[PDB]
Scaffold this active site. Structure first.
Site, PDB file in Angstrom:
ATOM      1  N   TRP B 121       0.358  -2.224   7.838  1.00 22.93           N
ATOM      2  CA  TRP B 121      -0.075  -1.369   6.701  1.00 22.93           C
ATOM      3  C   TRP B 121       0.130  -0.135   7.072  1.00 22.93           C
ATOM      4  CZ3 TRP B 121      -5.185   0.402   4.651  1.00 22.93           C
ATOM      5  CH2 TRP B 121      -5.206   0.461   3.106  1.00 22.93           C
ATOM      6  N   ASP B 202      -8.686  -6.837  10.105  1.00 24.76           N
ATOM      7  CA  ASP B 202      -8.528  -6.032   8.837  1.00 24.76           C
ATOM      8  C   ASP B 202      -8.542  -7.558   8.038  1.00 24.76           C
ATOM      9  OD1 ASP B 202      -7.839  -4.728   6.442  1.00 24.76           O
ATOM     10  OD2 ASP B 202      -6.369  -3.809   7.103  1.00 24.76           O
ATOM     11  N   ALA B 204      -8.849  -7.991   4.240  1.00 25.71           N
ATOM     12  CA  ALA B 204      -8.747  -7.395   2.720  1.00 25.71           C
ATOM     13  C   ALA B 204      -8.327  -8.078   1.825  1.00 25.71           C
ATOM     14  CB  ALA B 204      -7.694  -6.301   2.852  1.00 25.71           C
ATOM     15  N   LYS B 237     -10.111  -6.050  -3.545  1.00 27.24           N
ATOM     16  CA  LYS B 237      -9.316  -7.179  -4.311  1.00 27.24           C
ATOM     17  C   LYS B 237      -9.873  -8.481  -4.531  1.00 27.24           C
ATOM     18  CE  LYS B 237      -6.091  -4.149  -1.717  1.00 27.24           C
ATOM     19  NZ  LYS B 237      -5.675  -4.145  -0.419  1.00 27.24           N
TER      20      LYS B 237
HETATM   21  C1  LIG Z   1      -6.508  -3.360   0.458  1.00 24.65           C
HETATM   22  C2  LIG Z   1      -6.388  -3.084   1.894  1.00 24.65           C
HETATM   23  C3  LIG Z   1      -7.223  -2.754   2.659  1.00 24.65           C
HETATM   24  C4  LIG Z   1      -8.578  -2.022   1.996  1.00 24.65           C
HETATM   25  O1  LIG Z   1      -8.659  -1.275   0.701  1.00 24.65           O
HETATM   26  P1  LIG Z   1      -9.623  -0.597   0.284  1.00 24.65           P
HETATM   27  O2  LIG Z   1      -9.391  -0.191  -1.361  1.00 24.65           O
HETATM   28  O3  LIG Z   1     -10.019   0.528   1.291  1.00 24.65           O
HETATM   29  O4  LIG Z   1     -10.957  -1.694   0.257  1.00 24.65           O
HETATM   30  C5  LIG Z   1      -7.156  -2.475   3.937  1.00 24.65           C
HETATM   31  N1  LIG Z   1      -5.949  -2.943   4.362  1.00 24.65           N
HETATM   32  C6  LIG Z   1      -5.046  -3.647   3.820  1.00 24.65           C
HETATM   33  C7  LIG Z   1      -3.726  -4.259   4.552  1.00 24.65           C
HETATM   34  C8  LIG Z   1      -5.113  -3.795   2.519  1.00 24.65           C
HETATM   35  O5  LIG Z   1      -4.228  -4.333   1.605  1.00 24.65           O
HETATM   36  C1  LIG Z   2      -3.273   5.213  -0.091  1.00 22.94           C
HETATM   37  O1  LIG Z   2      -3.780   4.130   0.526  1.00 22.94           O
HETATM   38  C2  LIG Z   2      -3.672   2.897  -0.127  1.00 22.94           C
HETATM   39  C3  LIG Z   2      -2.266   2.429  -0.436  1.00 22.94           C
HETATM   40  C4  LIG Z   2      -2.175   1.150  -1.175  1.00 22.94           C
HETATM   41  C5  LIG Z   2      -3.000   0.388  -1.428  1.00 22.94           C
HETATM   42  C6  LIG Z   2      -3.092  -1.037  -2.034  1.00 22.94           C
HETATM   43  C7  LIG Z   2      -2.660  -2.113  -0.932  1.00 22.94           C
HETATM   44  C8  LIG Z   2      -1.408  -1.963  -0.660  1.00 22.94           C
HETATM   45  O2  LIG Z   2      -0.289  -1.574  -1.618  1.00 22.94           O
HETATM   46  O3  LIG Z   2      -0.792  -1.966   0.506  1.00 22.94           O
HETATM   47  C9  LIG Z   2      -4.432   1.008  -1.103  1.00 22.94           C
HETATM   48  C10 LIG Z   2      -4.660   1.958  -0.486  1.00 22.94           C
HETATM   49  O4  LIG Z   2      -5.841   2.605   0.003  1.00 22.94           O
HETATM   50  C11 LIG Z   2      -6.915   1.546  -0.148  1.00 22.94           C
END
Ligand SMILES: *Cc1c(COP(=O)(O)O)cnc(C)c1O
Ligand SMILES: COc1ccc(CCC(=O)O)cc1OC
Ligand SMILES: *Cc1c(COP(=O)(O)O)cnc(C)c1O
Ligand SMILES: COc1ccc(CCC(=O)O)cc1OC
Lengths: 394, 388
Positions: B121, B202, B204, B237
């Site tokens: 990510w 992580d 999520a 999510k």
């Molecule tokens: C969604 C996500 C998070 C966390 O999202 P938050 O909106 O901050 O709860 C962290 N890592 C990954 C890979 C995710 O897809």
């Molecule tokens: C900008 O950071 C983000 C980007 C994208 C997402 C959604 C999850 C994704 O697309 O990898 C969340 C974020 O913060 C919570």
């Protein structure tokens, strides 16, 4: 690895609580509380606020990711609330934050991001959280005389004398109104002189606005902040919605960056959005939505202002009563400052010995720096407090 | 002063979000057949109940509410939850839990390096870069098989030393969709215990893979093997409460004393960043988790979501098989989660978006939840036409 961790000290607030609760005295009073409490000793949910949550519960269709730096409705509403007709959107950058504290931290990060050799000047005294965050960030911290322990008023000569030593680039932290913990405040004329000193030195003012509406009113409380914004080209404002909206736990506040030109605004805005992203990404939605709803809905806005006003006047009357009582008992106008202070706090100016004696002998609790919460007083408790103060030789 | 601010680099995934017969396959948000991200039933009932019960909004717990903490720990670790050694911290989303995790570990070891998967990510590296932390990567994705290069992963991890942190995705690896089997997780625990590296998990997407409990299996295995571990959980999510910003950081310690230390440092971390953590989403989660009727409906809806997406994958795989007369794209049915990396190069990806109006992350990451019966053959066809 975690065993290497150096022990971090507790909040202290809880230590004050544990002691108070353990006190077997039925007549014990608690003035160390840091939030608003009504006649019954409760911290209610404002009417309009409860109205907005009902409205939201019936109109919100999704909880997907929204604005990284906040929703426009909230940014515009807050800016207008703080700066009124003076809001110049072209040069103002806004960031929804996790409370006013989150706003403070972000402003600190942004300023240090734009100036690595940043030094911050904080009043003497100030909200302990200020110094704590700064110490944590490793930032240099300088103090400027503020509270005059004898008159319990503002030592303006000392304040000006110390601020005169600030250099271009340094940051000066000012409480917009209702100085926490003192209660002593600057008049608009004193603000005008502070403005001159800031122009001269070229220091960046960071205004902590957490009590708009608890002093002399919404507009009046923002008067100082509005003078600074109109005379100083760059200004940082960390606003809290915690107290004046009664949504403490929701964590709602915002950082306003008043810039010299549109180009700089775009630069600051981008950096603020970047800062949110590197800390928690998107800011909390609930509280901010409650606030914009109240502020944009005429009916709600009206009720909220009305309720905030009742709160303000109620506390102001408490001040006059306590002051009256203290005058009758002292046979002097010594404690008149109580009636002059604004906000829900006031530093009595009692030594730690006097503070300890007041608790042991009168069962009255307060912060160790003799800061009391006006809202924790009432018709029954005022006479007792007044007597205690006179008896311990304050 | 402010004029000295250097322009910052925007977020790619969210950049697309802003850009968007348009087909949105970017941002990792669940969507229903009608392209909507609904509020889950139980979450809605919880908000109503909350409107009636809450009598105040005064400040609460600096580390989050006792209920939220106990509920979250149980959801993640199940009956492997040892409270006397676990410290919990409510944070501003899973992202906040990550940042908090990196600050906690850095306090304990100023010389720590972080190993991240190749790929991972984007936000992981972003924050690490910002904090000025040394980032190593470990092989994970096999560009050929579209699976996991486990041999390469084990190779690079063995080079990690005690004091280093290894960031692992608990399940539904973002952005690849390639995951480790339980057999592979045990293997990884062996490496972690041999090198003494602190794993940061992580978590999520617990619930979007194979199931609530199954998605936590890997995490529960590391926790039973490694005496000290950090877990950054997100409720964005699986509870569909993305904008509420709710998640938490769990610190599994080897003993009570260390637990006391960790919990203290964690509370201090919230205090110095924004003081108290947001209450709304956390309260929603604990209300759902502790109310039998609500928890049952949440699980049902989450399982319905999970099964649906799994059906979509099999459809897309089949559609392509027919259109390519091959089974190269079989991997799409094997990947697990919300995402799946295709392979399409940057030029191919860009062509697809500028004419077919179907936006996917530059690295060919598609959010399968963004597809449906109507759009599947369209997507399958669109990639055939973009060829390779
Ligand atoms: C969604 C996500 C998070 C966390 O999202 P938050 O909106 O901050 O709860 C962290 N890592 C990954 C890979 C995710 O897809
Ligand atoms: C900008 O950071 C983000 C980007 C994208 C997402 C959604 C999850 C994704 O697309 O990898 C969340 C974020 O913060 C919570
Ligand atoms: C309350 C307060 C704040 C902000 O608190 P938040 O709960 O984080 O909004 C900031 N400064 C002072 C002086 C305060 O009293
Ligand atoms: C824990 O930090 C705080 C302490 C105290 C307060 C209440 C205001 C006071 O007591 O000065 C707020 C805080 O964060 C917003």
């Amino acid at each position: 690895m975690l065993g290497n961790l150096k022990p971090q000290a507790p909040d202290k607030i809880l230590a004050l609580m544990g002691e108070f609760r353990a006190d077997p005295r039925q007549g014990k009073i608690d003035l160390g509380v840091g939030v608003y409490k009504d006649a019954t000793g409760h911290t209610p949910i404002m009417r309009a606020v409860h109205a907005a949550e009902q409205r939201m519960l019936e109109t919100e269709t999704t909880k997907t990711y929204a604005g990284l730096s906040g929703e426009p409705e909230f940014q515009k509403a807050m800016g207008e609330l703080i700066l009124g007709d003076g809001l110049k959107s072209e040069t103002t950058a806004t960031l929804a934050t996790v409370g006013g504290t989150g706003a403070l931290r972000q402003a600190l990060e942004l300023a240090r991001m734009a100036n690595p050799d940043l030094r911050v000047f904080v009043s003497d005294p100030t909200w302990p959280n200020h110094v704590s965050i700064m110490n944590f960030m490793g930032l240099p911290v300088q103090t400027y005389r503020y509270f005059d322990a004898e008159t319990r008023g503002v030592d303006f000569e000392g304040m000006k004398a110390d601020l005169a030593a600030a250099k271009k680039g340094d940051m000066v932290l000012l409480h917009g109104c209702c100085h926490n913990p003192t209660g002593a405040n600057l008049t608009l004329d004193q603000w005008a002189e502070i403005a001159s000193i800031l122009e001269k030195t070229g220091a960046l003012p960071l205004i902590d606005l957490a009590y708009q509406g608890f002093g002399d009113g919404l507009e009046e409380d923002a008067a100082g902040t509005r003078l600074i914004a109109s005379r100083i080209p760059e200004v940082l404002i960390a606003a809290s919605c915690s107290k004046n909206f009664g949504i403490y736990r929701e964590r709602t506040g915002c950082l306003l960056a008043l810039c010299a030109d549109a180009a700089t605004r775009e630069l600051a805005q981008g950096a603020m959005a970047f800062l949110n992203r590197q800390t928690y990404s998107f800011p909390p939605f609930h509280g901010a939505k409650i606030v914009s709803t109240v502020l944009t809905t005429p009916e709600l806005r009206a009720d909220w202002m009305a309720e905030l006003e009742a709160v303000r006047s109620g506390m102001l009357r408490l001040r006059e009563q306590l002051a009256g009582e203290l005058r009758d008992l002292s046979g002097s106008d010594r404690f008149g400052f109580v009636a002059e202070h604004r906000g829900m706090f006031s530093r009595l100016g009692a030594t730690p010995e006097q503070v300890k004696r007041i608790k042991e002998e009168f069962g009255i609790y307060m912060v160790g720096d003799s800061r009391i919460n006006i809202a924790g007083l009432n018709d029954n408790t005022i006479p007792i407090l007044a007597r205690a103060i006179i008896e311990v030789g304050v």
